């Protein structure tokens with residue numbers, strides 16, 4: 001009854017968490033993109 | 043660590059027992075006032091509203107029981123913090139459903155109504171206390187393996203950018219899929 | 235203490251969501267679903283399948299935009315469910331299964347629309363409770379009044395509902411499909427007259443912005459036409475997103491005039507002033523004075539500069555000279571419905587009017603026809 | 608770990624080959640096949656039948672040089688296969704049957720060209736997998752962008768491809784056959800004006816070197832012509848391989864000007880600036896701003912000194928004044944296509960887009976029209 005519901009919430013929360021990790025990772029890598037791009041690429 | 047959640051677990055148990063007693067009193071008020079007919083039949087065994095409010099209360103208890111179990115796993119290393127807060131979310135949904143049902147199905151001035159609202163608020167606050175205690179007890183509360191990585195090669199860095207953005211998009215698409223899966227499992231659970 | 239309720243006004247063209255007790259919606263975004271209509275060639279981007287809300291409004295160049303709600307009737311239920319998902323989890327960022335939800339609906343809507351709304355809210359989002367209210371009643375609540383005739387003109391529906399001392403008169407409720415989106419389409423049609431060609435849905439959004447930023451209701455239509463012909467003062471310029479500048483003249487007041495002369499778009503119905511007067515005339519003679527004195531206007535389509543003065547003049551020309559006519563047009567009327575919902579969601583007396591999940595499970599969706607007007 | 612992929616930009620004039628993940632091509636050599644046109648008289652010498660690449664560039668005195676690729680279309684398949692063999696076994700010195708090969712192609716090319724390329728890669732070299740990418744998309748990859756209009760001007764084909772958020776607009780793709788080789792021919796024609804007669808293919812290579820060493824794009828063509836006709840400051844000298852010193856004046860900037868005035872060579876098409884502006888105007892109105900701000904140039908023909916400033920001035924004269932226009936011209940743009948190809952082939956996601964030789968054997972060469980843009 002509720003076991004499947006809580007399991008679906010489990011997967012939803014795992015994936016929300018790793019999505020937020022992906023956000024932080026992409027942001028921090030984008031922060032340093034100036035170093036390996038030329039001036040015209042800035 | 044484990045003792046703090048166990049005290050909060052006992053607080054959970056006390057609050058939910060008071061909630062069950064309040065629900066029983068509300069059911070007694072409903073039949074005496076003729077708000078809803080009492081069929082003392084265990085439709086679909088426990089179900090959700092067999093014999094009325096108390097059935098919901100039972101499931102609410104059941105819900106928080108799972109919550110308590112998660113707490114132990116949280117203090118033994120078999121459950122994540124998101125698991126415990128998802129169980130707390132289910133508990134909150136159940137108690138909100140029960141409280142709104144009794145609020146619309148009973149007199150506003152009823153003493154049982156005030157007891158029900160107080161018990162629901164106590165259950166919610168104690169659940170949040172258990173949630174925060176278990177999250178603080180778990181060492182994985184603030185743990186991230188991501189770090190600053192960069193490549194000197196212009197080909198290498200742009201590859202990092204594109205790979206990160208691809209993980210971005212694929213995770214977002216899978217989040218859309220997972221939301222659809224959760225909606226489907228909710229519809230299958232109950233479809234009237 | 236008590237869990238706050240969610241107020242979600244899903245209009246034909248805008249979704250306004252927030253929490254009970256607040257004085258303004260927390261999330262206001264277009265109710266559009268965009269799907270890519272080109273070929274994705276760079277693997278790094280172009281993997282998402284659909285964009286909802288402001289994202290679709292920012293990526294309109296490469297998207298086909300569709301409104302799931304047309305004339306106040308939900309036509310694409312998958313898209314509407316997607317929009318509700320976006321509203322709950324992205325904009326409001328709350329779990330719907332802990333807050334009772336107050337939804338809105340235009341009067342005289344199809345019954346299956348309301349039943350499907352209830353079924354989705356209870357079986358897909360698992361809300362503890364719901365209530366579907368009439369937008370005009372919410373507007374009256376927001377006005378702080380118990381008597382008046384509400385003229386709510388949204389993106390897709392324009393309806394007049396008279397209420398006297400908290401009692402609605404269903405036989406006098408008037409509904410007219412002529413609304414903001416029809417005005418946008420007519421503005422596109424008449425902008426073709428100056429050589430400006432807007433065809434795609436993104437161009438429709440651009441024309442909607444032009445309408446919102448440059449159109450007004452003329453006090454006297456013929457005099458305004460004569461003035462526009464004689465002088466170029468009415469002409470005004472607007473900058474397109476691509477840098478081109480377009481100048482529009484009489485169109486600025488020709489588009490909103492369709493509100494009062496629907497025949498401009500081939501509709502046989504009378505203008506909003508005549509519909510309001512007919513709605514008042516359908517009411518009992520003893521209550522017509524208060525309705526005349528309590529004209530309440532809400533909705534985005536009633537935000538045109540000078541619309542209140544034109545409505546007052548038309549109704550004065552229609553009504554007997556002895557009656558005192560007052561158009562109540564608060565500056566925040568574009569959110570009035572939502573505001574009223576917030577008020578209705580904060581009343582202690584309203585807490586017994588919720589349609590709980592117990593009633594839905596024991597009675598099915600049809601319960602929504604026994605607890606909501 | 609995983610076997611690296613081969614990136615082989617088979618341009619009309621040059622072949623740029625290397626391994627995915629590197630930041631520069633390992634082998635850059637002219638795509639020419641030379642055959643002796645005289646009689647061998649030394650028994651120990653003059654026996655090889657054909658020279659390929661840089662070797663043919665060292666023996667041009669006794670060779671007829673032919674380009675197997677003309678206007679981005681492979682015309683001599685035996686010569687092209689010879690060049691590919693020289694690339695794999697001599698320059699790169701690797702076995703092609705272990706590395707998936709990424710090949711490039713100009714947009715709007717004949718289907719038979721791409722099908723024959725696939726058939727040669729799978730039947731002659733037995734590559735594990737292959738992929739034909741569009742050069743403009745790779746050029747955009749190299750610049751670390753997802754939005755922009757790529758102007759790729761190679762040796763034999765110029766083309767504008769607009770992309771917005773990773774979505775290409777195939778209806779707005781423009782292709783112009785005017786390119787570096789036509790500029791070389793026009794430079795030969797106008798060098799005959801000063802008495803310098805270049806006729807043979809080797810003399811064509813000499814003129815190409817002159818073009819690469821002395822030609823530039825004038826900011827204002829008429830003022831530059833007046834200055835050249837008045838002063839001698841624009842006259843530069845160049846030493847021929849036989850020791851003769853030639854002096855060229857306005858021909859330094861009158862040659863690249865053909866890119867902006869194709870009528871100089873009798874072509875009716877418009878210049879590269881007008882083609883870029885037309886490609887932008889063929890796009891949706893909402894994305895024209897981002898395209899205006901992201902003009903990306905690539906290819907050898909865009910290495911002319913001062914071409915970016917001239918392009919910026921022309922497009923500014925064409926576009927509305929409000930719009931901001933930025934020409935992105937990285938200093939390594941002569942290898943932008945290959946760098947983008949390496950970036951794409953190094954992606955984990957791209958690893959699923961490989962046309963495997965399994966799919967080739969069941970679907971035939973036509974599979975390349977279902978898996979590549």
Ligand SMILES: Nc1ncnc2c1ncn2[C@@H]1O[C@H](COP(=O)(O)OP(=O)(O)O)[C@@H](O)[C@H]1O
Pocket residue numbers: 244245246247248249387388389390414415418442445446447449533534535537538539568
């Ligand atoms: N300032 C304005 N002037 C004229 N029209 C406006 C203005 N603001 C909004 N509108 C129109 O009102 C519509 C939005 O009305 P709204 O109150 O959001 O209705 P709904 O209840 O359908 O969301 C839009 O389609 C727009 O065309």
Ligand SMILES: Nc1ncnc2c1ncn2[C@@H]1O[C@H](COP(=O)(O)OP(=O)(O)O)[C@@H](O)[C@H]1O
Pocket residue numbers: 617618619620621622760761762763787788791815818819820822906907908910911912941
């Ligand atoms: N510095 C330069 N100035 C002017 N033209 C150049 C320069 N370098 C190369 N070119 C021209 O560009 C062409 C090479 O372009 P390339 O990027 O190799 O195109 P392809 O895609 O055919 O390989 C040559 O034919 C040459 O004439």
Ligand SMILES: [Mg+2]
Pocket residue numbers: 245369386387388389533534571
């Ligand atoms: Mg509205």
Ligand SMILES: [Mg+2]
Pocket residue numbers: 618619742759760761762906907944
């Ligand atoms: Mg090229």
